[PDB]
Design a protein around this ligand. Structure first.
Ligand SMILES: O=C(O)c1sccc1-n1cccc1
Ligand SMILES: O=C(O)c1sccc1-n1cccc1
Length: 148
């Protein structure tokens, strides 16, 4: 829950659509997108995209069955990603950040036609505008990774 290579991926639902949320656990930085279907294929695609942008070493999820997809495992394999086992399940920080992201989405929803755009507005607010040495999550992730 503190190595700089750990990301957590989960799905949540809004307006009948699926939002995939990835959290960089050490910093609190978020990546999220609306995806057309809650599937292993979309999970795998997202992992490939994420790993090309950030150094992804291990991945966790609050729904372990997500990672039983052979397409997910192939994306893993190709990108050199392993599964994270040092984070126990809380039947939660990451769950709460997901709930906070949904709150931000609601606050900006009427400023965009499509949910996908509101989600990106909320990610921007979460990573860049929120501050909590009073840096943003975007500042924290780059500092953590650069130091590593
Ligand atoms: O998409 C699939 O066909 C399979 S099969 C085993 C797990 C998954 N999955 C679905 C959502 C996230 C992962
Ligand atoms: O208003 C919209 O629905 C779209 S669609 C693509 C970008 C935007 N947007 C949102 C804020 C500023 C621009």
């Amino acid at each position: 829950d503190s190595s700089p290579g750990i990301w957590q991926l989960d799905c949540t639902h809004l307006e009948g659509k699926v939002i995939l949320v990835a959290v960089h656990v050490a910093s609190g930085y978020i990546e999220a997108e609306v995806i057309p279907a809650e599937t292993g294929q979309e999970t795998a695609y997202f992992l490939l995209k994420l790993a090309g942008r950030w150094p992804v070493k291990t991945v966790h999820t609050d729904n372990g069955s997500n990672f039983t997809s052979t397409t997910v495992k192939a994306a893993c394999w190709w990108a050199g990603i392993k599964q994270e086992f040092g984070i126990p399940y809380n039947p939660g920080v990451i769950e709460s950040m997901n709930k906070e992201l949904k709150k931000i989405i609601g606050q900006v929803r009427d400023q965009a036609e499509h949910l996908k755009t509101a989600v990106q507005m909320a990610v921007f607010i979460h990573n860049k505008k929120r501050k909590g040495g009073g840096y943003s999550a975007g500042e924290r992730i780059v500092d953590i990774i650069a130091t590593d």
